Amino acid sequence: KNQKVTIMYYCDADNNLEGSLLNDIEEMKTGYKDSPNLNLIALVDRSPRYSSDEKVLGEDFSDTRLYKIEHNKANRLDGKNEFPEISTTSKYEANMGDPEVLKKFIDYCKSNYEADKYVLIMANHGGGARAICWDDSNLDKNGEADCLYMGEISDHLTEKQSVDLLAFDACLMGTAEVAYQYRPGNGGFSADTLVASSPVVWGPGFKYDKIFDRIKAGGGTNNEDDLTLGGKEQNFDPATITNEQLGALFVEEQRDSTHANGRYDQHLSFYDLKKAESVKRAIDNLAVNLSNENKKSEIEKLRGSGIHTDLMHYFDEYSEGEWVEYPYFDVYDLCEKINKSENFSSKTKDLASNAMNKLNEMIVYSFGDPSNNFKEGKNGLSIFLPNGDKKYKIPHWTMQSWYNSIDTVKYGLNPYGKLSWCKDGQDPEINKVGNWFELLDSWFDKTNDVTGGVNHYQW
Ligand code: NA
Ligand code: NA
Ligand code: NA
Secondary structure, eight states, X not given: OOOOEEEEEEEEOSSTTHHHHHHHHHHHHHXXXXXXXXXXXXXXXXXXXXXXXXXXXXXXXXXXXXXXXXXXXEEEOOOTTTSTTOOSSOOOOOOTTSXXXXXXXXXXXXXXXOOSEEEEEEESOBOTTOXXXXXXXXXXXXXXXXXXXXXXXXXXXXXXXXXXXXXXXSSSOOBHXXXXXXXXXXXXXXXXXXXXXSSOOOTTOOOHHHHHHSSOSSOOEEEEEOTTTSSEEEOOOTTTOOHHXXXXXXXXXXXXXXXXXXXXXXXXXXXEGGGHHHHHHHXXXXXXXXXXXXXXXXXXXXXXXXXXXXXXXXXXXXXHHHHHHOXXXXXXXXXXXXHHOTTSOHHHHHHHHHHHHHXXXXXXXXXXXXXXXXXXXXXXXXXXXXXXXXXOOXXXXXXGTTSSSSOGXXXXXXXXXXXXXXXXXXXXXXXXXXXXXXXXXXXHOSOOSTTOTTTTOOO
C-alpha cells in the first residue's frame, strides 16, 4: 500500500541504436513524475561513433555511466562498492554483453535503491532464444560484437538478482523458450512477469514518456480509451502499482504509439512467467504424441516453407537468413491449426487444446496484427519451428545447433546453448522423444549415434 518500486534500465547504446536509446532516456525524463515511491536507475553504455548528443545526459561521452533519472533531470551517480569501476568522474568502458556487468548493475540497484518491487528494462537488439544486448566495444572469439546469451545469463546470474518484472526492449524476445528460461522457481535468476515482443520492434521502441506519465499518484484518468484493461486509461500510483498494471501500461502504450503511425505489424505481450512451465510441459506432451504418431509431414505442411507459410509467424519469410536464424511461429496458432486440422487424431487434438488452455492462462495481455486475426491473450508467444531439412549445400538444422541443452562451446559448436527449455523433460532413453527439442532433433538430425548427430545430442 506504500511500496517502493525500483526500475533498472540496462541501456546498451554501444551500437547503431544509440540515438534511439538517448531519445528513450529523454522520453523517460519527460514522463517521469517525482515520487518517494519510485526510482529510475540507468546503466547507460554509449558508442564513440554514432550519436554525438550532449543534450539528454548533459554532455557527449562514449564510456559507461550510472544515472538516476527524475523529472527533466538525470544526475550522475557513483558506483560505490557494487560497481567500483564507475564513479562521477570515471571513464570506464563496460562490456554490456558480459553477464557479470548486468549482475553488478542489478546488485548495485538492489543495494543502493532498495525497493519492494523490482523492474528490469533491458534495451538493445534481440535475437530470439539463442541472444540480447550486442556490444561493439568487446569482440568475441569470432571478431563479432559480444552479446548476452539466455543460457549465459542463467549461468552467471543467481536467485539474488531476481526481479518482479522483466521488460525486453529488444526484437524477437517473446518466445516460449525465453519465458521458460527465466520462470520463477528455476533455482536461479528469474522474473515473475515478462514484457516482450515476438517479432522485431520498430525503431522508436517503447513510448516511455506515456508509460511514465501514467505511473503517477492521485488516481484520475485521461480521455484515452484503454483497449487492454477496458474503460479509460487509468493512472497507477507507484505505491500500489502491481505487475499486471505495469504490464498493461507497457502493452497499451506500445499499442497506441505503434497504431498511431499505422504500424500494425508491431506486437507486444505480457506474460505471467509462473505459468511458463505449465505451457512448456503441455507442449512437451504434444511433442511426445507428435513423435509417436509420425507427424513430421503434417507439421511441416502446417509450418510451410520459403514464402509459402500459413502459420502465424514473426520473421520475414522472404529472407532465408531469417528462416535460418529466427524461424519463430505463434504457439497458439500452431496448436489451433493442429486442433482444427483433419490430419490429426483425437489425442493430438486434445493435447493441442490443453496447450491452448495453458497458453491462454500464461499470456495476460497481447496486441497484434488484426489482419492476421490476432487473438488477444492467446496469440503473442512464439516457438522455434525450423525448416530443418531445407538446404542452404547445408541443412538448416545443422546451423541451429545453438538451439540446444548442452554446452555447445565445449563440444566445438557455435557459442552457447544450455537452454533449460531443451534440457528439462528430455527422455533419457535412446530414440525416445521427451520434449520439443528432442522432437525437432528426431525430425531433422539424420544420424543418432552416441556422437549425437549434428548438434552433439543423442535423442
Ligand atoms: Na561497451
Ligand atoms: Na488507447
Ligand atoms: Na543429434
